[PDB]
Structures are given as structure tokens and as C-alpha cells.
Amino acid sequence: EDSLAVIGISCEFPGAKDHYEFWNNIKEGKESITFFSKEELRRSGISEFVPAKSVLEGKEMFDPGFFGFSPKDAEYMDPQLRMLLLHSWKAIEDAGYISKEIPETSVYMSASTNSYRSLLPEETTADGYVSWVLAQSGTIPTMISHKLGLKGPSYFVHANCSSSLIGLHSAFQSLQSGEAKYALVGGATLHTESSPGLNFSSDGHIKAFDADADGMIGGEGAGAVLLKKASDAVKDGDHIYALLRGIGVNNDGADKVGFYAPSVKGQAEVIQKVIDQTGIHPETIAYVEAHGTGTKLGDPIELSALQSVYGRYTDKKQYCGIGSVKTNLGHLDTAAGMAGCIKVVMSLYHQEIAPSINYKEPNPNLHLEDSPFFVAEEKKELTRENRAHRMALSSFGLGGTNTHAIFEQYPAGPFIIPLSARKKDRLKEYAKQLLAFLERKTDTDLADLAYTFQVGREAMEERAAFITSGTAELKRQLADFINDKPAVTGCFRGEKGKGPKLCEMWSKGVAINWHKLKDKHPKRISLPVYPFAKEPYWPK
Amino acid sequence: YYEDSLAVIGISCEFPGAKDHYEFWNNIKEGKESITFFSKEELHPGFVPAKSVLEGKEMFDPGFFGFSPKDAEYMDPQLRMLLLHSWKAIEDAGYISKEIPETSVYMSASTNSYRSLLPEDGYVSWVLAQSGTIPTMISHKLGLKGPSYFVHANCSSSLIGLHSAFQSLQSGEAKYALVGGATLHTESSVHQPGLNFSSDGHIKAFDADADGMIGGEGAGAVLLKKASDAVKDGDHIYALLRGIGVNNDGADKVGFYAPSVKGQAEVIQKVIDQTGIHPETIAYVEAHGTGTKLGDPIELSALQSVYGRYTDKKQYCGIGSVKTNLGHLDTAAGMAGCIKVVMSLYHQEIAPSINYKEPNPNLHLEDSPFFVAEEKKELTRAHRMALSSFGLGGTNTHAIFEQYPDAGPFIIPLSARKKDRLKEYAKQLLAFLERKTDTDLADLAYTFQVGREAMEERAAFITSGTAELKRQLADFINDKPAVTGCFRGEKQQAKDIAWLSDDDDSAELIEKWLAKGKGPKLCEMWSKGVAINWHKKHPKRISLPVYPFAKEPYWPK
Amino acid sequence: LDTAAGMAGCIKVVMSLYHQEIAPSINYKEPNPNLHLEDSPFFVAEEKKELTREAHRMAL
Amino acid sequence: ESGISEELAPGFPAKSVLEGKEMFDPGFFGFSPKDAEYMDPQLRMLLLHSWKAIE
């Protein structure tokens, strides 16, 4: 364990509002592209066009009051900044931590240049200079660091397409270097678009690994993950979805014909680099998440390169699944690496391989038969024999910057739940979601849930604290709480001495529910995160 | 002891689904089938199944052998293939062809009317490519001075070669023997039942549902030596060949297309009398495995009859066909069966015979000494296996094989005709090194120093250890390394070499080189010319990767 | 074919065995649940079945 | 075979069952049918078994 651990996740992708919904979507083969009828009245009047988009809803949503921001400020802010801000808070919550208590944390972000400032009216001599500062790349990671109070190195990284992996790679060196304890990597692409050709798809589908593959289609998303050193994650009893063993980074050389040309030899070198670096053996790999552009030229190249490296270490077979999430989501540009990363951290987490859609018959160019790979067609669950499955992820930039990564599979009677929020509806919306969560996931241990809310959620202005002996009691106290004022149970609301009902005077006092929970502490657990308000901001 | 028969000390082959003898074994052991099928979207299905094909039958390396490109085209593919395989098999042995002139050559091939593909003229180019030309072209290119000729019976071609080699070596008329077989077709695509031919395109071996067989393409060659001449020499031995017999059916009803029980019977008996090897000592028999309702019963009837006349009385013997995996080899059938059996003995495993579900009622298999093998068993006195091949002619052959059971700095000289060949040579050497966790570089180095010709383009490596090598190799392949470990070079210093040629002076100094064991400087000198690398209790020869021919395609149009 | 019913059934069966195939029964969309084939040894022959040797029988 | 396909429908998806827990031979013991309906099944079962065991 000289690699990292993914201990928190937050994401929004087309048709998914979190990583749990995202995973169920790809698992059952659903595609998140959209089609329009003549119900295409975004604007109009033509033919010869594919009315297909991979939009993600609610890109304009934000909760400005949380970070003490003004509505003018939000309008001035890039949606991407806003999004990545929301997601980072959330990813750390997912981890079971309070932002400000883990300060020794680095921040690495990337986002597209959408020319958001361009839609604003004025930029005249003195104000207006504020819009420009807010429009710079450095502002995004740095704003998150200030708002979450993180004192590790914070900066912005970009290499088109492959940029999210550039974040992981940065985080990796940093975490290995011992300069930071935690690392935060996020990626976003949200566009400013209202107001077939060159490997654009004909039919609006990314047909990956298929004979009929033609081009790609674009998408929007944002996501962030929280990383910690693996050795420390076990020791600290953190909750680990997966392990990141290694990640290679390299740029295609002037070899290729043209700037937008992909290069076999360049890709081959990164895959090689990671194997050398990790010491992982290619037989060890159950699944690979390819770049999967769905282009006639590219897919052959991608596979040729993989087969060629793997050919080096061990003899031909057909044991390895290969697929691409882009089929479901489209090409997410900057956050492409991010989506792949999650899809795969999730597949390892649930020990399943997820199907690659829009596929019927393979590409004869592929020589799939002699390759070690078979295109994932349907979900197949991985075995129980070996407790350390591995998966690989590829991302290759437009620039000629290629990235490859490998992941590994990782194997009382009275509780108090403190719930807080900035506002009372929030605190109320908070209640529906925990309630809703509890319904679905049942064999869910309250001991950890209590521990994880006592810690790893900040104690905010408005509060409810609950005393319970069971979930079933809990829903009911919660179920009745949602409806405005029952007053029925052990529930306290408001806006050293060990052992008792501290809630009322944690309603608002303090309590470091740290001494409560003697020698052995419960796990942190992945539970619903703060419910941000959904308010729209966009220029007019 | 009876170490009067031969040792097989080299193998080379290309078969459907297998591009060498090692891949071949893993496919058969795992039960992999190498027939190929085409879905109906490729360019009339009354009864149309698919084929079993050998990739890269067209490909060849003319430049290696000083051949014109136009010549290759005028050359039967089988002849080209048998050439490359014969070269490989000797490298597989760990020998230089030039250094072992006393080698007989026996080859066999399907005459595929290749010439009729060409356009032509009483005036310019004969182009009379005959059967005799194949073995003789090989003997000339490898410089072999043993009797070299072509042998053919129809399905029993390879076994005739082994028989020839057997008589030749025992007779002492040669030190080594090289036997090959090959059938490549020139009709390009797929058959119909009715008087033999699988209904479904599968070869049912001893199964109830057997309806016929499907044709196949392959070529392979082996290098043989007398058993004693192998152990004493310290050669690397896969297996031992105890005996091989031949005879013909005679007249019998079924003037010509059938499987005569009495004839197959006669040879199996004959070999046994010759080898006087008990039958209970046979774990496995690699049968003719035609896959026809009429034939398979005949084989077993005859096989059993011979066993019946012996303390037998127990179903103890495995019976199979590799024809199930590969199809029927026009003139490589024997070779394929041969390699499977040598390979089964080498690794001490029996290989499943696939496409089998239920016992043919006719076999009467339960009284028999045989059980059909549906699985990947293991094994663990030395083991013995028998092999059969029965010709279309009525020339039958049977054979028995026996098992052959058990530093500091290193120098590897790498060579090729060209730089690209040499880089690719490295990849294969490197790919191989990954494949095994411990092997021996004492042995790997030795085999490369000796038993590989030192060609024009050279790379020599001086290494301390196994992973120490993998790393240097990786750099050479990427090709712009300054990093040492290796000396590059090219046979071109006639002004330093022929000029400074050990003129029976390479002495006390070149000797210093050995009588001391100072490596590198030696690598430098070898990087252009001339070093008998023979100065090491020396290590044993080992089966390592062999020359990777360029694969350039030639074919008439 | 009242009189010739047996005859047709007979030839179809004699024929199915000759070629080792099972001929499909047509006009079948879904089974009448009044048969309870679930526990029936039988399954209706929706499409055909080329067969493989292993001496075969068929009742009429 | 309710529209609660949820936790398990753990709440418990499968049961371990004794066929004929209700069945009885009341007349054997001079019992009115009305009377059996009042007696516990466990008692009835233990009654039959106690007879059976001694036999």
C-alpha cells in the first residue's frame, strides 16, 4: 500500500444526481442522451442534424447563502466554479469529515473554458474587475480552499479530455510526498450553448467497439473525489470504495500526423509506464475502461496499444472486459476522466462489471479474437475467489496527453443523531432525505450513522437532535418531524459531564461527541449529504 | 538400455489457432477449437458450414535466404513454409545448421496445383516446382549433407518421414534427422455432407453423433537424434520415439476408401513386437480420429484386438484425436498428432478430446482398454503414448513414444539480418522472459552464444540478472538509449576483422578474454566480427525464441 | 383429414425419424394454461429441433 | 404469491412450513368439532404424537 484510497465521492452526470444513482444507471444499461421530436424549440428551422443532446439538468442551480455569497456574486460566477464548490463540500461529507478539521488537504481542479463572462453585459472602468478575477481558472480551486479552509497546495490543472487524471496524478505525488494528508480532485464541463462532421456521430450514439462506430457526442458533468493514503485510510478506519495503485502521465510526441491525431505508440508508453511503476501483472486485470471515443480510427488504435503491451507480459487469452461509460453519458470533455474513474471505483466497490451499450457486432478492424479483451455486452458479476480484483482506466487528450490508471478492489441500544442546516427548510429537506435513505437501505447500522453525523457533519445554525433506540423509531420520529409540528418524541430543536441527554443543550451548546463514542469508535459511513437549495442563476 | 530409438530435440509448427508448438499445447489442453465460422453477412445455404484456416500462409521472408521477390511468388507456399519451419526447429534445438551437416531431410506436402495460379512461353522461365525440390531447397539453404528426399502417403505422410528418419539414424547414415509435413491449399473457401464431410462442420471423435470430418491446414517440422546421441551430448529432449511401423492394406472390399481393421491391426501388432513394450504401459493413444461412424469403430476394434491378446482386462487407457481441435491435416495430420503426443509426454498431462458427449454404441467401449478423455487430467516409471495415422491409400502407421524425465555475469549476443528484425527479436525475447518466473540465464546465454548464427546486425548484452536484462531489453526496443548494458554493431569491419581476423593469433589475448572471463570488451569485438563463444562444465541448451521472420506476403494474381 | 389423418401423422413421424428432426407445430402463440405443461413431461414444439444420435422413438 | 416487494417480504422472503398443522382427528378422543376449534393446534399435535410415540 504505496497507493491512494478513494474515501469520498460526489458527482452529477447526465441523468444521475449522485454516484449511487449513476451506478444503477450504467449497471442496467440506461443511456442518458436525449432526443427531441419537433419538440425542439430551443430554436429552430432546419434539417439534414441530429436532435440529440446529452444535457445534464440543473446546471444553473446554486446555494449562494451557504458560503455567504450574494446573488450578484453567483451570476458573476462560472457555473463550473459553483458546481465544483458544491461537489467538494459534498465529497468530504461523503468521506465523513468536516472540512475545517481536515485542513492539510490539497485541491486540484479542472474545467472547460466556456466564455461565461462573455454573456455578461458590462465590464466598464471603475467596478467590473471582479468578474475577471472570478473568471480565472485559479479562482475555482482557491475559492474552494478558502471556503472549506484547506491549507494544502491548491491549483488548477488542464489537459483537454485527460484533465481529471491529471488531477489524480497531482494528488498522488502530493500524497506520496507527505506534503499533504488528503487530496481533493474534481472535474467539470458545463457549456454556455444556446445563442455529422469531424467524428461527430451520425445517429447521436457513441457506438463503442462496433463496426458501425462513427463519431462521438458531447456531454456535461462535474464530480469530485476525496483521496487519502491507503495505509492511513485503514489505520484511521476510513470508508474505502477503492484503491488507486498508480497513474501514468505522458504526451504524444511530434510523431503523429496532425494535432488531433491519436498515436498508438504514445498510448502504449503510458500503459507500460503504469505497469512498470505499479508492478501489477496484466493477468491481474478483470476490466479496462477505455477512452472509447467511438471513432473508426481511434478504437483500433486504442486496442492495438493495449494488446501490444499486454502481449508483453503474458500469453494471449480472452479474460479482460473492455468498455466505455461514454456510451451511456457521451463525451464529457474535461470530466471524462472523472466519470470513468467513478464508474470503475463503483464497479470495484460492488464487485460488478457494467455493460457497454450500443453494441451488437464487433469491429473487424479490432482483431478482438486474438486480443485478451472481450467487449462488455451485459453485466456480469466478478468472482468471489480472489479478493483483490483490479481494473484499469484510460484517458487520452486531444492535446496528445495520455493518462492511464489502475485501481484495486478493497475488502448499543441508544443513539443520538444531530442534524443541522443553514435554514429550516434545508434542515427539513435534510429530514426527507435521511428518511428516504433509511427506507431503501435497511441493514444499515445506526451506530455508525450516529457516529458519522456527530462527527463529519458541521453543526450548523438550525438544529434538530434525536434520541433513538432503533431505525423504526427513527423514521417515525423523522416521519412525523417532516410534518410541521408534532412535538411527540425525544426530539430537540433550536437555533466532562459524561453519559447523558446532552441534545437539548447541544440543541445549541457544543459537545464533542468524541469522548462519548471510550476506546472503540464506529465506522464512518456514506450517508446523504447536505441538501443544497436549488436556486437558478444565469445572465440575462 | 533400449536407448536405440530417437529423441525429439526440436519442434517448430504453425497450426490453426496456434502459431507455435507452445500455444498449440495450451489450446488443446484447454479444449480450444480452432475451426472458424462465418455469420451470414459476408460475401445459398443449402448445406453450407464454415472453415478451419491457417493465418499467414502467404507470408514469407525471401531476403533471409537470398531470394528474389518474384521467386517467392513462383514458390509453393508449403515449400516456403517448410523452409522457415525447418530453420526454426534447428534453432529450437539450440544448433547452428551449418555446424550439423550430417542431417537427413524428409519432407512431405500436398501438391496444391500452385503453379496453375500463374499466367504462363517456350522461351523464358521454366518454373518447374516439384516435390523433390522442397527437401533439397532446405538442405541447400541450411547446408545439410545427409540424404534429402520427399516422402508421401496421403494422411500418413509425416509418419513415413519419422519411419525414414528412424531407419536412417539407426543405420547410422546420419547424425540428425529433420522431418516435416505440410498442407496448405490454394482454393480459397464450406462443404456439404453426403459421402463424408461433417454435417455441422465439427469432427466428432468416437462420439455417437459422428457424421464426418473437415479439412485443415498446417505445417510443422521436428529435429531428431538418436536417444543415446542426445543424453550424452546434453541436448534438450522433449520426448523419446521408441518405434514406428508401416504397412498397407492390400486388396479388400473397399478397394480404396475405407479403414481396414485387419491392416491397422497388423501394424499396431508389428510395432509392439518391435518395441516389445507392454500395452499396459500405455497411458494414452492418439488415434486416427477420423470422426466417421464407420471408421472409429474400426480403429478401436483393431486397437483393442492387439491389446486383447495381452494382459489387459481393464479400462485404463485414454484415447483421443487432435483432429477434433484442428481438423484433418492433408499432409500434416501425422505431424500434428505427433506434436500433441510429444507435448503430452513433456508436460506429463493428457489432453481432452473435445466435441464429445456420449459414447458411440458401436465402440463397445466398456470391455475395451480405453476410455475417451473428456477432460484435463494430470499424470504422475516413465509414461508411454501411442500414435496412429491411417492413409487414404491404405498405408497405415503406428508409433509409440516414451517419456524423457530428468553463476555470475552473463552475455547475450543478439543478431538478425536487419535492425527492425533485431528490435522485434528483442520483443519476443523480452515477451518470453516475462512468461516464466525463474528460468536460467546460464542456459539462455549459452544457447544464444552457440546455436544461434551470428548475423549481420548485432546487439550484445552484458547483464547481472534476470530483471536486470528485462530493463536493458526494454530500452533497446525504444532505441535511443545511451544506457549501457549493450553494444550495438554491424558486420562491416573487413578493414578491422578480415584484416585483424584471429589469424591463428587470436590467442592468449582472445584467450585472455576467456581464460579470464572478461565480458564486455568481448561484446565489442563480437559486435563486428568473430568469437568462438565456446569457453565455459558448460550449461545446457534450452528452448528459447527463434528468428522472427519478416512477414511479407506473396501470391499470384 | 379424417380418414387420412392417421396417415398424415404417420408419414410426418416416419419422416421426422428418417431425417432425425422434429418438425414445428404452427399457429402457436402461447400455451393454453389448462394443460399445465409446467409439470408435463411435454413442451410444445414452437420451432424445430435438428437432432443428434445417441436409436430414437416417437409416439403417434 | 401483497405489493411489498421490499426488504425481503430482514422481514422475511421464504418460510419453513409444516403442512397440515390445522388437521386433526377429534372424534378419536371423544371431541366435538366445535371443541377442536377452541383447542390449540399445538395441543392437538402433541396429543396425536403422544399417542403415536407410545405405539
- Please give the residue of chain B at the shortest CA–CA distance from C54: B208
CA distances to A61, A92, A141 from A78, rounded to whole Å, are 11, 22, 13
Quote the DSSP letter at residue A491.
Answer: E
Shortest distance, CA B178 to any CA of chain A (angstroms): 29
- Please give the residue of chain C at the shortest CA–CA distance from B362: C54
CA distance B152 to B262: 22
CA distance B111 to A67: 85
Shortest distance, CA C22 to any CA of chain B (angstroms): 17
Q: Which DSSP helix (H) or strand (E) runs through A247? A: strand A242-251
Contact criterion met (CB below 8 Å) for B111 and B67: no
- Phi, psi for residue B422 in degrees, rounded to 5: -65, -40
Provide, as residue numbers in chain A, all residues whose Cβ is less than 8 Å from the Cβ of B431: 311-313
Q: In what order do the strands lie in the sheet with B410-416?
A: B410-416, B457-463, B486-490
The residue whose grid cell reads 549459452 is: B446
Q: Where are the alpha helices (DSSP H) in D1-55?
A: 33-38, 41-54
The residue whose grid cell reads 425525544 is: A490
CA distance A466 to A504: 10
Chains that touch C (3 or more CB pairs under 8 A): B
CA distances to A85, A88, B270, B461, D46 from A148, rounded to whole Å, are 9, 9, 91, 57, 70
CA distance B405 to A26: 54
Shortest distance, CA B479 to any CA of chain A (angstroms): 13
CATH ID of B1-406, from 3.40.47.10, 3.90.1150.10, 1.10.3720.10, 3.20.20.80: 3.40.47.10
- Phi, psi for residue A444 in degrees, rounded to 5: -115, 125
Domain ranges for chain B, please list them.
1-406, 407-549
- Phi, psi for residue A185 in degrees, rounded to 5: -120, 130
Shortest distance, CA D10 to any CA of chain A (angstroms): 7
Cell of A442: 435497511
- Method used for this model? X-ray
Q: Which residues is chain B interrupted after (C–N above 2.5 Å)?
A: 43, 120, 189, 380, 406, 536
Cell of A321: 472486459
- Which residue in A445, A453, A434 sits closest to A513, CA to CA? A453
Residues of A with CB under 8 A from a CB of D: 442-443
Quote the DSSP letter at residue A334.
Answer: G
- Which residue in B225, B219, B246, B247 sits closest to B237, CA to CA? B225
Q: Mutation target for B interface from A212, A283, A312, A314: give the one with most B CBs within 10 A.
A: A312
Provide, as residue numbers in chain C, all residues whose Cβ is less than 8 Å from the Cβ of B209: 52-54
What fold is seen in the domain A1-411? Peroxisomal Thiolase; Chain A, domain 1 (3.40.47)
Contact criterion met (CB below 8 Å) for A287 and A347: yes
The residue whose grid cell reads 492539510 is: A104
CA distance A153 to A199: 38
Assign B97 to helix, strand or coil: helix
Quote the DSSP letter at residue B64.
Answer: G
Strands B328-329 and B176-183: unpaired
Q: How far apart are the first and last CA of chain B?
A: 57
Q: Which DSSP helix (H) or strand (E) runs through B83? A: helix B77-93
Assign A473 to helix, strand or coil: helix
Q: Where are the alpha helices (DSSP H) in C20-46?
A: none
Provide, as residue numbers in chain A, all residues whose Cβ is less than 8 Å from the Cβ of B23: 315-316
CA distance A144 to A139: 8
In chain D, how many H helices and how many E strands? 2, 0
Shortest distance, CA B438 to any CA of chain C (angstroms): 49
Q: Where are the alpha helices (DSSP H) in B289-332?
A: 295-308, 323-326
Q: Decide if A315 touches B, using CB distance below 8 A.
A: yes
Q: In what order do the strands lie in the sheet with A491-494?
A: A415-421, A462-468, A491-494
Contact criterion met (CB below 8 Å) for B18 and B218: no
CA distance B181 to B197: 23
Assign B486 to helix, strand or coil: strand
Are 3 or more Cβ–Cβ pairs between A and B shorter than 8 Å? yes
Is B20 buried (19+), middle (13-18) or exposed (0-12) by CB count in 10 A?
Answer: middle
Contact criterion met (CB below 8 Å) for A263 and A256: yes
Cell of C33: 394454461
- Please give the residue of chain C at the shortest CA–CA distance from B210: C53
> One-letter amino acid identity for A336?
A
Contacts of B270 (CB under 8 A, 6+ apart): B245, B247, B398
- Please give the residue of chain D at the shortest CA–CA distance from A441: D7
Contact criterion met (CB below 8 Å) for A109 and A141: yes
Cell of A253: 510526441
Q: Decide if B20 touches A, using CB distance below 8 A.
A: no
Contact criterion met (CB below 8 Å) for C58 and C52: no
Measured at the CA of B166, the angle between CA B165 and CA B169, to 5 degrees, comes to: 80
Q: How far apart are the first and last CA of chain C?
A: 15
Half-sphere exposure at residue B242, Cβ-oriented, CA atoms within 13 angstroms: 27
Output the DSSP codes for B199-251: SSS----SBTT-----EE-EEEEEEEEESHHHHTTT---SEEEEEEEEEE--S
CA distance B114 to B71: 13
Provide, as residue numbers in chain C, all residues whose Cβ is less than 8 Å from the Cβ of B358: 54
Cell of A467: 434520541
- Return the bridge partners of B81, or none: none
- Return the bridge partners of B458, or none: B415, B489
Cell of A326: 461514454
Contact criterion met (CB below 8 Å) for A431 and A409: no
Cell of A139: 479562482
Q: How many residues does chain D have?
A: 55
What distance lies between CA A344 and its chain's CA centroid?
11
Q: How many residues does chain A have?
A: 540
Contact criterion met (CB below 8 Å) for B163 and B397: yes
Chains that touch D (3 or more CB pairs under 8 A): A
- Which residue in A411, A453, A410, A401 sits closest to A431, CA to CA? A453
Contact criterion met (CB below 8 Å) for B170 and B4: yes
Quote the DSSP letter at residue B18.
Answer: B
- Please give the residue of chain D at the shortest CA–CA distance from A438: D7
Quote the DSSP letter at residue A43.
Answer: B
Measured at the CA of B291, the angle between CA B285 and CA B292, to 5 degrees, comes to: 125
CA distance B58 to B75: 11
Q: Mutation target for B interface from C20, C50, C51, C52: give the one with most B CBs within 10 A.
A: C52
**Four-residue CA torsion sign, A477, A481, A485, A490:** positive
Assign D30 to helix, strand or coil: coil
Q: To the nearest 10°, the Cα dihedral for B482, B484, B490, B491?
A: 160
Q: Which DSSP helix (H) or strand (E) runs through B441? A: helix B441-449
Cell of A437: 435513505
- Please give the residue of chain B at the shortest CA–CA distance from A369: B17
Cell of D32: 366435538
How many Cβ atoms from other residues are within 10 Å of residue B498's Cβ? 11
CA distance A184 to A90: 11
Chains that touch B (3 or more CB pairs under 8 A): A, C
Contact criterion met (CB below 8 Å) for B413 and B454: yes
CA distance B113 to B76: 9
Q: Which residues is chain D interrupted after (C–N above 2.5 Å)?
A: 1, 9, 12
Shortest distance, CA C40 to any CA of chain B (angstroms): 26
> One-letter amino acid identity for A81?
L
Assign A240 to helix, strand or coil: coil
Q: Decide if B427 touches A, using CB distance below 8 A.
A: yes
Question: Which residues, numbered 2 to 31 in chain D, qualify as contacts with chain A under a Cβ-Cβ cut-off of 8 Å?
Answer: 7, 10
Helices B333-347, B21-30: inter-axial angle, 10-degree rounding: 80
Q: Mutation target for D interface from A439, A440, A441, A442: give the one with most D CBs within 10 A.
A: A442
Contact criterion met (CB below 8 Å) for B385 and B338: no
Output the DSSP codes for A98-143: -GGG--SEEEEEEE----GGGGSS-------HHHHHTTSTTHHHHH
Are 3 or more Cβ–Cβ pairs between D and B shorter than 8 Å? no
CA distance B30 to A444: 45
List, as own/partner pairs, every contact residues B245-249 make where C-beta atoms lie below 8 angstroms and the sequence separation is at least 24, other chains included.
B245/B163, B245/B270, B245/B271, B245/B274, B245/B397, B245/B398, B245/B399, B246/B156, B246/B159, B246/B160, B246/B163, B246/B395, B246/B396, B246/B397, B247/B395, B247/B396, B248/B393, B248/B394, B248/B395, B248/B396, B249/B394, B249/B395, B249/B396
CA distance A396 to A345: 19
CA distance B97 to B452: 9
Assign A396 to helix, strand or coil: strand
Half-sphere exposure at residue A66, Cβ-oriented, CA atoms within 13 angstroms: 23
Going through A256-377 in order, the beta strands assigned E by DSSP cover: 285-289, 320-323, 352-353, 373-375
Contact criterion met (CB below 8 Å) for B13 and B221: yes
Provide, as residue numbers in chain D, all residues whose Cβ is less than 8 Å from the Cβ of A442: 7, 10
- Which residue in B288, B237, B221, B275 sits closest to B86, CA to CA? B221
Contact criterion met (CB below 8 Å) for A320 and A373: yes
Contact criterion met (CB below 8 Å) for B246 and B160: yes
- Which residue in B55, B17, B28 sits closest to B324, CA to CA? B28
CA distances to D1, D7, D8, D12, D13 from D4, rounded to whole Å, are 11, 8, 9, 11, 11
Is A536 buried (19+), middle (13-18) or exposed (0-12) by CB count in 10 A?
Answer: exposed
Q: Decide if A312 touches B, using CB distance below 8 A.
A: yes
Shortest distance, CA A441 to any CA of chain D (angstroms): 8
Assign A467 to helix, strand or coil: strand
- Please give the residue of chain A at the shortest CA–CA distance from D7: A442
Is A292 buried (19+), middle (13-18) or exposed (0-12) by CB count in 10 A?
Answer: buried
Assign A292 to helix, strand or coil: coil
CA distance B347 to B376: 12
CA distance D39 to B398: 85
- Return the bridge partners of A403, or none: A249, A395
CA distance C22 to B294: 25
Contact criterion met (CB below 8 Å) for A529 and A10: yes
Measured at the CA of A491, the angle between CA A486 and CA A494, to 5 degrees, comes to: 95
| Residue A405, phi-psi category: left (phi > 0), alpha (psi -120 to 50), beta (remainder) | beta
What distance lies between CA B445 and its chain's CA centroid?
23
Contact criterion met (CB below 8 Å) for B335 and B155: no
- Please give the residue of chain C at the shortest CA–CA distance from B209: C53
Cell of B224: 531428431
Strands B282-286 and A61-62: unpaired
Quote the DSSP letter at residue A525.
Answer: -
CA distance B457 to B446: 19
Helices B157-170, B333-347: inter-axial angle, 10-degree rounding: 60
Shortest distance, CA A283 to any CA of chain B (angstroms): 11
CA distance B493 to D22: 106
Half-sphere exposure at residue A184, Cβ-oriented, CA atoms within 13 angstroms: 38
| Residue B517, phi-psi category: left (phi > 0), alpha (psi -120 to 50), beta (remainder) | left
Check A313 against B434: CB less than 8 A apart. yes
- Which residue in A533, A418, A521, A538 sits closest to A468, CA to CA? A418
